[PDB]
Amino acid sequence: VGEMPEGTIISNVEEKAGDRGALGRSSGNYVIIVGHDVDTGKTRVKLPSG
Amino acid sequence: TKRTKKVGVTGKYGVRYGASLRRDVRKIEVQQHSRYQCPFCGRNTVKRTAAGIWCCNGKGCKKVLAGGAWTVTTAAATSARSTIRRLREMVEV
Amino acid sequence: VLAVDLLNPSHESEMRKHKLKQLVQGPRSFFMDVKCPGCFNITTVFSHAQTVVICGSCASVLCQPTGGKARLMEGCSFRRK
Amino acid sequence: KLRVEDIQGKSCLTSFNGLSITSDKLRSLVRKWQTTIEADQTIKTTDGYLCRVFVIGFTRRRANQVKKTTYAQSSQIRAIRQKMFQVIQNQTSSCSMRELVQKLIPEVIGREIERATGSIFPLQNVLVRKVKILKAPKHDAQKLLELHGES
Amino acid sequence: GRMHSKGKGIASSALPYVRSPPAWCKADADSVVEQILKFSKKGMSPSQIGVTLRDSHGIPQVRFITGQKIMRILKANGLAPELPEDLYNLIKKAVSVRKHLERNRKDKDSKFRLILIESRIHRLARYYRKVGALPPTWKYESATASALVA
Amino acid sequence: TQKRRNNGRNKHGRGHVKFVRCINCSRAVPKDKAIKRWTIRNMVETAAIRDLSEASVYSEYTIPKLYIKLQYCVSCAIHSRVVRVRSREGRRIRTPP
Amino acid sequence: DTINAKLALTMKSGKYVLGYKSTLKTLRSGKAKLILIAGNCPPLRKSELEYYAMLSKANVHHYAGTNIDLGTACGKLFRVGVLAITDAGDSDIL
Amino acid sequence: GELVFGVAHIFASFNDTFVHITDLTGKETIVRVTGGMKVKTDRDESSPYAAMLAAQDAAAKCKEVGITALHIKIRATGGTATKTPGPGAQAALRALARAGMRIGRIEDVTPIPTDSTRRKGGRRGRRL
RNA sequence: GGAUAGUCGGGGGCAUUCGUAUUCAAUUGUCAGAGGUGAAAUUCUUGGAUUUAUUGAAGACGAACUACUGCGAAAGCAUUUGCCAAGGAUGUUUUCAUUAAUCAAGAACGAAAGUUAGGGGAUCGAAGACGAUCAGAUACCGUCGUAGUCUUAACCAUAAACUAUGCCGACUAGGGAUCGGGCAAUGUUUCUCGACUUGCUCGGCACCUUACGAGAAAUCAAAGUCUUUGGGUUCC
RNA sequence: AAUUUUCUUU
Ligand SMILES: [Zn+2]
Ligand SMILES: [Zn+2]
Ligand SMILES: [Zn+2]
């Protein structure tokens, strides 16, 4: 997730590293990469629920 | 003969379930039971099987496509594909 | 004014009018025979040509079509008749 | 405009961040009964630097014109825009930020545009109204030392 | 008074009073006739025939030297197209507009222009069927218009 | 009766023109119907030139101005007296006084 | 100039080969100058045709548009996958 | 070269005038005084007298730090609004000039729109 | 009618590019008012309001240039570029040869508002909520605010949709501006062309004076060429 | 800001 540009549309996103997919798995649903933060690397994303 | 003024494919439902619901189902089933063109073969032979799977027959290009519930491609997916294409070009260049 | 000779209008008053509006409508164009600067053949061309003119002998373009009179850029000693 | 980036001995160092024209000058330049042509282009330097530079130019009288319209047809406007585009690309093909600043102060872009627009409407008051910066290098932490250190 | 427009232009060509062959010319009549035949085999419309002959070869009006119109010459020598040039150009324009519309369905202005061209084509076809230039069962169908042009 | 030959706006060869907003009352007035004035005012009053000069830098720099285009509606212009009701004979003139 | 007009005038006066089997035959015989490959072609077939043209020193043009568009440009009512221009006639296709 | 240059923003609205003074940069400002804290009538906030009172109070607080010259920048409401500076702009300028603090680089930085969104009023406008 | 050459157009559609402004979000600086109004008042602000500074997102719109100027059958069309189809005028010793004008019935487009499903909803803002004015304000004023304002696929089909003025054709008075084209200058200017100046002409948008003429008059170059009443054709 | 009303005739 951290290697993707901001605003990209993704699916089957992991909540944790190695989780193997937790978010945006239902049909027609997706997750939006809102922003990045390198210092203590964390990515903010938008879930289908908003 | 026209055989149907407006119900069309929903004539199998008779008079029940409501007119608005029948109209919405009529639009969905018209999209669902439609032959589409294979983006690799150029033949109008793509048909739906089990709500999201689209296959076209023939001697070649027996591919199985992951599409929408009743259309091969949805507007949201096309917009996402364009957005991802744009982002990939910016990253590459 | 209020008394004119429409039978014989002045030449100056006629050359300043539109070709159709004249007493008897007539063309305002003509044909001229030009000579290639490095040859001897003579080719007749139209003053309002709409096509690229090429000399019969080994030569380049003669004139370029335009809305009105085409411009001659080759050094042709044209004779108009 | 300058962007403060580095601190050296309690004396902050800044870097080029863009140029613009005052509102008073822009309003004075904009006038009625004349045609204004404004264009833009994005340019790249030898290093990582994306600069979106604008340009604006106004039609001019010939000190003998009797009419007061002084207007140019849209085809001539498009031809003028192409001439500005060609001039910008030719003069900015390989400059880097040092040459960009060294050539914007004497106003060579506007002069070249006016020279190239000789075959079209003479044009006047051609200048870069605004230059915007979109990408930046890796802070140039060592190139700032290379450039500075003198006096 | 434009048939499908509000324009009132009067631009045209004013033929000279002297309905005679040019005083200073050597067209030789038959040579020009075979020259028109050569250009007809080359495949250019009669309007292009007159334009090229007037602009380049130096004959102002072909009928002045030949004695007949160039379309009459082509019909007499056998190289007569089945469709008249004006109708062919109108149908070709209609085909181009239809192709543009079928690729871009949102061009309402093009749809309006197609309606005008369709009306003009039908009026011209009715005139040609009445005079006898076309078979009385000529008709005009958009599906076969492409094959008609080609 | 037609009070004005032009119907109060410059609309010849057009079918529709965009509408602008009045500065005072924010009414939607057509572009060809809005009364336009150009306020070209120095950034300071003429009575503060001496004070600004005695408190300025840059060795007699040029004092800038402000250029504002004011577009009034009919009612607002009449109230503001930029445009005034004239006689029938004087209505047919357009040259500024 | 464009290429659709050039293709049309080669159709009027020129030598063309339609399809894949005949295109392979023409490339094999060596009487080939230009091959046109539609954008909807199978990737394996495109690689094979490119290899054939490289062996036979024939130019390749993978023009945009599907095989339906290629057939429409060719003036046929059926889909055309591979075009083989053997004689350009009076054109500059090659 | 013993002069220190700040940046004095003036926001001349028709309801209240802002006299904001910062350093040469944007952040880390020093003084911000309006007509609201100079007159308590809720009516003369935009009055020239209140504007000059706020301007001279800003001058005194700036002289407390020890800053000599200011780059002045006046600005109206801007955007999709009147876009004309109020009466307090000139009063603030004169008050700063009279207080003895140096003035330089006068400019108007009101935010102009490139045909921005709709203005309030409802077509017919504010029929007051 | 068609073709041809150089043009012209804020004419149409598709893709693409740019601009500030509005709102919102995060962060940084001092503090007491900020909005708004005739006056206010509602509301929120020592928990940091407002302002200033940096970055970003959303949607809308193309200010100034912009005009008694352009295009389109009209409704309407105003950021850059590219593509496609089409259009008027002009030039023409090019082509066809009456192919023409106006229309019942029948069809295309048809502002804004209004409807059905999908997306999006920044600003404004029907309904509504409060707060001031008034005897009563249910409204005009301030803030917020749903539908709506944007768009796609289907609908309808009217406005002071106006030039309150049907379309085609002939004639009729003097002048000066403006747009597009063409013609002419042993004209001017700038490192073969452009810009400017002058004259002529065609087609538009209009303007000033006047009334041979018309009208009941206001006024009209058509609303004139009508008791001296008849060019043709629809609507009413 | 704010300003509603003037019976039927002589
Ligand atoms: Zn397939
Ligand atoms: Zn030649
Ligand atoms: Zn107003």
PDB file of N, CA and C and ligand atoms in Angstrom, chain F residues 22-27 72-77, ligand 3:
ATOM      1  N   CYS F  22     -24.760  42.749  -9.926  1.00  0.00           N
ATOM      2  CA  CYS F  22     -24.561  44.113  -9.461  1.00  0.00           C
ATOM      3  C   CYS F  22     -23.695  44.119  -8.207  1.00  0.00           C
ATOM      4  N   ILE F  23     -22.874  45.161  -8.073  1.00  0.00           N
ATOM      5  CA  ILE F  23     -21.972  45.238  -6.929  1.00  0.00           C
ATOM      6  C   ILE F  23     -22.748  45.505  -5.645  1.00  0.00           C
ATOM      7  N   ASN F  24     -23.749  46.384  -5.703  1.00  0.00           N
ATOM      8  CA  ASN F  24     -24.430  46.817  -4.487  1.00  0.00           C
ATOM      9  C   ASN F  24     -25.499  45.820  -4.049  1.00  0.00           C
ATOM     10  N   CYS F  25     -26.523  45.622  -4.876  1.00  0.00           N
ATOM     11  CA  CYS F  25     -27.657  44.780  -4.519  1.00  0.00           C
ATOM     12  C   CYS F  25     -27.533  43.351  -5.031  1.00  0.00           C
ATOM     13  N   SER F  26     -26.493  43.047  -5.810  1.00  0.00           N
ATOM     14  CA  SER F  26     -26.250  41.698  -6.328  1.00  0.00           C
ATOM     15  C   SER F  26     -27.414  41.197  -7.182  1.00  0.00           C
ATOM     16  N   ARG F  27     -27.972  42.085  -7.999  1.00  0.00           N
ATOM     17  CA  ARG F  27     -29.013  41.696  -8.938  1.00  0.00           C
ATOM     18  C   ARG F  27     -28.395  41.163 -10.226  1.00  0.00           C
ATOM     19  N   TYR F  72     -23.186  48.357 -12.523  1.00  0.00           N
ATOM     20  CA  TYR F  72     -24.410  48.654 -11.794  1.00  0.00           C
ATOM     21  C   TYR F  72     -25.633  48.180 -12.568  1.00  0.00           C
ATOM     22  N   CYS F  73     -26.693  47.870 -11.828  1.00  0.00           N
ATOM     23  CA  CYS F  73     -28.001  47.648 -12.421  1.00  0.00           C
ATOM     24  C   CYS F  73     -28.679  48.994 -12.667  1.00  0.00           C
ATOM     25  N   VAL F  74     -29.871  48.957 -13.264  1.00  0.00           N
ATOM     26  CA  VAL F  74     -30.581  50.196 -13.570  1.00  0.00           C
ATOM     27  C   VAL F  74     -30.982  50.919 -12.289  1.00  0.00           C
ATOM     28  N   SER F  75     -31.614  50.200 -11.357  1.00  0.00           N
ATOM     29  CA  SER F  75     -32.083  50.833 -10.127  1.00  0.00           C
ATOM     30  C   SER F  75     -30.921  51.326  -9.274  1.00  0.00           C
ATOM     31  N   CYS F  76     -29.866  50.520  -9.148  1.00  0.00           N
ATOM     32  CA  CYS F  76     -28.726  50.920  -8.330  1.00  0.00           C
ATOM     33  C   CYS F  76     -27.989  52.104  -8.942  1.00  0.00           C
ATOM     34  N   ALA F  77     -27.848  52.123 -10.270  1.00  0.00           N
ATOM     35  CA  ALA F  77     -27.182  53.246 -10.923  1.00  0.00           C
ATOM     36  C   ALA F  77     -27.961  54.540 -10.730  1.00  0.00           C
TER      37      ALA F  77
HETATM   38 ZN    ZN K   3     -28.008  47.011  -7.940  1.00  0.00          ZN
END
